[model samples]
Target: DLTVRQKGNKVIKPDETRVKQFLEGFNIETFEMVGTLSNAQGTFALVKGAGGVHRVRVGDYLGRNDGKVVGISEGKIDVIEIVPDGEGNWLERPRSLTLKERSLEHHHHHH
Candidate 1:
């Protein structure tokens, strides 16, 4: 008579941890576009968060849903996020941040 070998408990880690590090502490809800700079070099957006301001360009990750900066326009920043479809699938969701308006600022302001 031979005895059957039992399987041991295996440790399975979720991929969320790996992706979490890529988030880099920027959350779309807490961050807002303060301004933008565009030139022959490249386009960039000045985003302000609880940690202060950050300069971001295309392909930078934001938000908890893994939002990526896709485009930066005058007074606006566009992003796409990979979010769950609630059916075990992922989908791309469009998001954007508009430059914050201040009543004390004039439209002619430039830096």
Candidate 2:
């Protein structure tokens, strides 16, 4: 996770220098599943979205709110998104994308 500078009890602010957004262009709704790979370099996640597959790892950027890839697991990807607090300030929130739920259509699974 990128080091976030926290303000005191009276204030909350986000650092402008560390803020970034890589996946801001495409809609997150299109992201379906993510596959994992392990090798000499390390673990890598291939995310399938509307724009096709994307190679992701720790520190890589994603989402519209200057989100950054914080962790990658077997079934999901965790990210920290910086968004507006509606009061003209900024805040960091944790977000995640799962391996399923690709579209709006409903489906059922057999038990």
Candidate 3:
């Protein structure tokens, strides 16, 4: 007769999977915007897309490669994206969105 086997609350291998897929085919520069605003609270920029508007602030993800919004100033948003280097590794790519005289394409340097 076959019998089922078990110990007192036996625990098996505890394995976990990590997610590493990041879509790099898209970026923040492809979006359209209506205007920008700044207040005592903080700086904010709005982007109008087919779906709706996208509001971004500090520490917010903005682009592909999991780009993160690091700083927001008068008329710009600083972003840091993890991109691949020629050596096949990852590096921090600093990119910013600069607002030109009523334009959002005047886009700088690092902190």
Among all candidates shown, the one with the greatest lDDT: 1
**Reference-based TM-score of each model:** 0.65, 0.63, 0.53
lDDT per residue for candidate 2 within 1-111, as digits (tens), equals: 456444532334555565544455654444565687768898766787656677777777665555567777888878776666677776777777777754576553421
Per-candidate count of clashing residue pairs (backbone under 3 Å): 0, 0, 0
Report the lDDT tens digits of candidate 3 across residue range 62-88.
545555667666656676766665555
Which is the winner by lDDT between candidate 1 and candidate 3?
1
Q: Judged by TM-score relative to the true structure, which candidate is superior, 1 or 3?
A: 1
Clashing residue pairs in candidate 2 are none
> After TM-score superposition, what is the CA distance of residue 31 in candidate 1 from its true location, in Å?
1.3
Candidate 1 C-alpha lDDT tens digits along 1-111: 534232432223226555563335555656778899999989988888766777878877776656678889988899876656565566666788888866353433221
Give lDDT for model 3: 0.55
Looking at model 3, report the run of 10 residues with the lowest lDDT sum: 9-18
Quote the positional error of residue 89 for candidate 3 in Å.
1.1
TM-score of 1: 0.65
Clashing pairs for predicted structure model 1, backbone only: none
What is the C-alpha local distance difference test score of each model? 0.68, 0.64, 0.55
